[PDB]
Amino acid sequence: VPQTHPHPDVDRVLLDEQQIRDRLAELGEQIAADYAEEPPVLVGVLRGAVMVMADLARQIDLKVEMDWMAVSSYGSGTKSSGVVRILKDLSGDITDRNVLIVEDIIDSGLTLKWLLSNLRSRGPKSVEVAALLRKPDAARVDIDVKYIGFDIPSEFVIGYGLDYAENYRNLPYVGVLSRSVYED
Amino acid sequence: VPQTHPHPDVDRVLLDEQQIRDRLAELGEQIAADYAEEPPVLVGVLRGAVMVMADLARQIDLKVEMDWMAVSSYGSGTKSSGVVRILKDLSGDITDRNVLIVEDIIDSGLTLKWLLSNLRSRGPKSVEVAALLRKPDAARVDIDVKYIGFDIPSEFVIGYGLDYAENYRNLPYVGVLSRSVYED
Amino acid sequence: PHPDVDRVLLDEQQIRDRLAELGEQIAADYAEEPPVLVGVLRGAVMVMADLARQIDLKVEMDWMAVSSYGSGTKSSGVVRILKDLSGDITDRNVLIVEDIIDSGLTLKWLLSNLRSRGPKSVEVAALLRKPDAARVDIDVKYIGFDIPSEFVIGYGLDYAENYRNLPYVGVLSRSVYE
Amino acid sequence: PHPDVDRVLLDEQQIRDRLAELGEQIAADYAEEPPVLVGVLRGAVMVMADLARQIDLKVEMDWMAVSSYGSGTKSSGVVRILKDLSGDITDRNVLIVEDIIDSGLTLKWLLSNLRSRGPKSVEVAALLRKPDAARVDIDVKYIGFDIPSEFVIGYGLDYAENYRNLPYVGVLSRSVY
Ligand SMILES: [Mg+2]
Ligand SMILES: [Mg+2]
Ligand SMILES: [Mg+2]
Ligand SMILES: [Mg+2]
Ligand SMILES: [Mg+2]
Ligand SMILES: [Mg+2]
Known about the structure:
By secondary structure, the first copy, chain A, is an alpha/beta fold. Chain A has helices at residues 17-34, 50-58, 76-81, 111-120; strands at residues 13-15, 41-45, 65-73, 84-88, 98-106, 126-134, 147-151, 157-158, 174-176. Chain A has one domain: Rossmann fold, CATH 3.40.50.2020. Helices cover 23% and strands 27% of the residues of chain A. In chain A, the strands form two sheets. A six-stranded mixed sheet of chain A has the order 4-3-2-5-6-7, with helices on both faces. Chain A has a three-stranded antiparallel sheet with strand order 1-9-8, covered by helices on one side. The structure holds magnesium ion (MG) (6 copies).
C-alpha cells in the first residue's frame, strides 16, 4: 500500500493475537482446575463465539464436550426481556451436566441473562459463563460471570469472530471499527 | 371387503367426528367471548395439534393469529423436567400478547408444564391452554387448563392428528388403537 | 359480511365438496402406496388438515417451514429452511399440498429440492391456482379451483398474519391496504 | 501421551503450517472476490476458525447444522437441515470448509444443494482426505493432508462427543472403541 494513500496507518488494535492467546491459556488452566471432577459442556452461540470457543477449548485440558446454538431477534421483545428465537437448539440434553457458556462479549444486552435462565430450566447441575470481552455497560445487568478475558472500553469492536455487517470475523485480533473521518 | 375375511367390522371409536365438531364449536364460542378485547395468538406444537388447531381456529370468531412450534425429545431429560429440543421456534414475538396453546392431549408428561413456563419467560400478557383431550393421569401434574374438550379414559388414542408410529393421523375421529389378537 | 373481505370467492361448502372429490381421486391414485403429505407452513394448514381427512388411505404427514433469502428467492425460488422434513422420503411417494400456485418460483425450487432426496415420486395438490401459474413450467396433478388474480385470504391464507381462520376464501378488500 | 489416543497423526505445528500455506493460496485465488466460508457443524469448527484467520481477504463465514435421514443419507447423501445458511449465496463465491472427506455421499449432496441456490461458484477446502474419497467423483480444490484409513480424533473431530479439543489429530485407541 503506497505511503501517499490517505488512510490510517494502523487500524486501531485493541487486543492483539498474542494477548488473546496468553489470556485464554490462563483461563483454560483455571477452568481445567475448577471442573477437574466433572468436565463441562462448552456451549457457544453462533457466530460470534466461533474463535473464542475453538481457542479456549484447546486450552482446557479436560474431556470437555462442545455444543452450539444459533439465535435470531424477536425485535422489540429481545430488547426488553432478552428473549431470542432459537434457530438451532442444543443438540445434547444438559440434565445433570456442568455447562459453560462461552461468550464473545458481554454488555448491557439482556440476551445472556435470558439464555442463562433458559439453560437453567433444563435441569443442568450448573451453568456458568466464560466471556472473552466485557464492556463497561455489562455492570447494568445482574449476572455472575465467572471467567472474563478482558475488560474493554465501550467501542464497536471487530475481529476474532466479531463482525461488522458480516465482515472482519477473520481478523486474528480484536480491533476498533473506525468511526471518524480520516484526514491525511 | 368380503364378509368371510377375518378382520374386525368396526374400529373402536372413542369420539366421533360430530362429537368433536360440536364440542369445538362450544369451545370456540367460549374462547371468542373471553378474548373479545384482545385476540390470542394460537400456538400449536406440531404434529399432533394440526387438526384441533385448524378446526378450533375456524370456530373462533375473532382476528386470531396462528403460530407453530416443532419439538423433539432430549431423552431422559424430557421425562424428568419436560424440557424439549426446539426444532422450530415461534416465528413471532409474543411480548404483551395473549397466547393460547392449543393441544391435542394432556397427560402425565411434563412437556406442557415446561412449555408453559418457557412461553411465560418471553413476556406475554397471558398464556392459557386449550386441549382437545385429557387423560386421568394429567391430574398428577399441577397445571391449570382453561379449555378442555373431553376427559377420556387412559387408552392409547389415535386419529384427529394423533398417530401411532406416524399412522392414523388423518382419521376424522378419535379411536382407540387395538392391540389384541382378532379372532373370527 | 366481513368488512376486510371484498367478497367471498369460495364458500365453506364449495371447499368441502371439492376436497371430498380430490380426496377420493387421490385415494384411488395412491391405493397401492400411500403418500407422505407434505405441507409448507403456514398457508397449507387448513387444506392439509381437511384434505388429509378426505383421503381414505394410511397417509403420513410432514411439514416444512421456510424464510426468504431475499433477491435469491425471487430469481430461483430458493428458500431458507427453518424446519426441514422430519422423515426420510427415500423411495416414498410424496404429495406436496399447497394453498396456492402462481408465478412465484418457490414451488418449482421445492419440487426440485425434494426430488433430490431420492423419493419414488413427488406430485402436487394445490387448493388454488391463479392465471399467472401458467408462466412456470410445472406439472400440478391435482387442482382445487382456478381463481382470478386477486389477493386471496382465509382458509389458512393470511394478510399480514390475519384472516387465516376464515372458513372460506375471500378476496382482500382494498380498504385494508388503501 | 493421551490414553485414548493410540498415536498422533498430525501435530499442532504441522496443521498450523499447512493452513498457513492453504490460506495464502486461497487468498491469491480469490483476490478479486472473497468467498463466503461455509462450515458444517460441529466437525468444521477448528479448521474453519483457524483457516479463516490465515486468509488475508474480507471473507464472510456462515454455518450449517445437519442430522441424518437414516438409510437415505447413506444412499444419496441427503441430510436433514437443522440450521440452514443464514445468508443468500446468489452470485457469491462459496468455499465449503470441511474436516474430512471420504466415501460418504454427504459432501457431494451438499455441493449439489448449494449449487442449486444460484452461487457464482462453490469450491471445497478439506483438512483431511482418506483413501476412500477417490470413490466419490468430486473435485476438491484445497486439501490439507492425505491420511490413512483410521478413525481420527481431535482438532474438532469427535468420538462420541469427546476429544474435539485436542490440538492435534490423533488415531483413536481401540481400547476406547
Ligand atoms: Mg499516511
Ligand atoms: Mg455472542
Ligand atoms: Mg401435543
Ligand atoms: Mg404455499
Ligand atoms: Mg404471504
Ligand atoms: Mg464434515
